[PDB]
């Protein structure tokens, strides 16, 4: 674009090359045919050792399990992301901090209600999802005091700014944990969108549409889901993110929605995701609606990869790598289950 190239390359050549190469570092489709063709866990180890992945089952349990496959995929992901985030710079470092803050709020909601209930905090440490870090103190050994964690997490933990909405220590008990997580997800997401818009380059250009898509899709799925729960339509509109094309129009019809057909009509207002609707076969041995959503994510990830002077390439690599781990562990799951009629719930990425 106008500002980058002369200034992008100087401090982004390494990371651009790294994301390109690590896109190339995913398992080839020939490797995938090796994966499906063994139908055994020992041979699964054998030929995953022979690809980019693998050679990581050393010092592990002789009875290879699917959970070990999940752990190794996630360890590869977190290793690659610690590699990328270790080398960064205030704009892009901040970008990757946003990329991580979603999992931060997830793990942080895992930590909360481990201390409102009388449970150990060392108990909580090994169960955190990777990337969690949490090397910051005042949140550990809190003596089971809600106010201690409240102040610990307003003061010390980096994402304290979003908890200005989650205050008063009353929501901890009177209100659901999940609804709190949803408010924080919304507030964080809109803050991230505003940060993206502040950086008004091709970063904004490539990140606006995908954030609008994420807001639109999450409003779509949540509206589908809550037809069997206790929630009113105004408290409903309260927690839909503002950063979406729906806020201009489409969110109102979702608020008016009460069943599958009104949300179908909402999808029909916009041809881009109507197509994602009619791919919701949900057949035993094929893909489902969520898989078509992930597929559209993959397409937008490729579109981000096409451009080269922005920062959505790394977010694209996030979503693709998550899909890839979902595929490999799922293949391991169906290998252990021995049910080959049902291996088809994974989306190859590259």
């Amino acid at each position: 674009s106008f500002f980058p190239e002369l200034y992008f390359n100087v401090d982004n050549g390494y990371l651009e090359g790294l994301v390109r190469g690590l896109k190339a570092g995913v398992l080839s489709q020939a490797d995938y045919l090796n994966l499906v063709q063994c139908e055994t866990l020992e041979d699964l180890k054998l030929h995953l050792q022979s690809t980019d992945y693998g050679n990581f089952l050393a010092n592990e349990a002789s009875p290879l399990t699917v959970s070990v496959i999940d752990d190794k995929l996630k360890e590869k992901m977190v290793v690659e992301f610690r590699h990328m985030r270790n080398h960064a710079y205030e704009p892009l470092a901040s970008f990757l901090d946003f990329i991580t803050y979603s999992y931060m709020i997830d793990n942080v909601i895992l930590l909360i209600t481990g201390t409102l209930h009388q449970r150990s905090i060392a108990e909580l440490v090994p169960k955190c999802h990777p990337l969690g870090s949490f090397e910051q103190m005042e949140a550990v050994n809190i003596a089971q005091t809600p106010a201690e964690l409240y102040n610990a997490i307003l003061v010390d933990t980096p994402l304290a700014a979003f908890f200005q909405d989650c205050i008063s220590e009353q929501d901890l008990d009177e209100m659901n944990i999940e609804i709190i997580r949803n408010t924080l997800y919304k507030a964080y997401l809109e803050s991230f969108y505003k940060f993206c818009t502040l950086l008004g380059g091709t970063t904004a250009d490539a990140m606006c549409p995908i954030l609008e898509f994420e807001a639109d899709r999450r409003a779509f799925i949540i509206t589908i889901n809550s037809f069997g729960t206790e929630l009113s339509k105004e408290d409903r509109a309260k927690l839909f993110p503002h950063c979406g094309r729906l806020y201009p129009e489409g969110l109102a019809q979702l608020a008016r929605a009460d069943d599958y057909e009104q949300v179908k009509n909402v999808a029909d207002y916009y041809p881009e995701y109507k197509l994602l609707f009619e791919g919701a076969g949900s057949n035993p041995g094929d893909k489902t609606l969520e898989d078509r959503f992930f597929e559209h994510e993959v397409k937008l990830n490729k579109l981000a990869f096409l451009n080269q002077f922005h920062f959505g390439v790394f977010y694209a690599f996030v979503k693709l790598k998550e899909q890839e781990c979902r595929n490999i562990v799922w293949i391991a799951e169906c290998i252990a289950q021995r049910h080959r009629a049902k291996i088809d719930n994974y989306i190859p990425i590259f």
Binding site: I109, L110, T113, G114, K127, H129, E178, R181, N182, Y185, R218, I221, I222, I224, N225, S226, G228, T229, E290, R326, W330, E333, Q337, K342, N345
Partner: protein
Amino acid sequence: IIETKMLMGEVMREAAFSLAEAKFTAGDFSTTVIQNVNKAQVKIRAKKDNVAGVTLPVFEHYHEGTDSYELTGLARGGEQLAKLKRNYAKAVELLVELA
């Protein structure tokens, strides 16, 4: 006994399949659901049967009706979760019968 056992087998297989699909959907809801254990919505009622001069222990599947723990935060997997709420519930009923 054996007919109940075979129906048992196919039902549990189907239900734990729906569990695998939910794990694909929401990722790691296992941790939060094990985290959330305060009250149950189903109990067992011990009643008697005098099929003969002997007294026979027998059980019934009572439903207390306590609110279940709806989960929606993890990518809004509730569509898989309700499917599970049915698949495992049928299994539980058949368990009580078998016991």
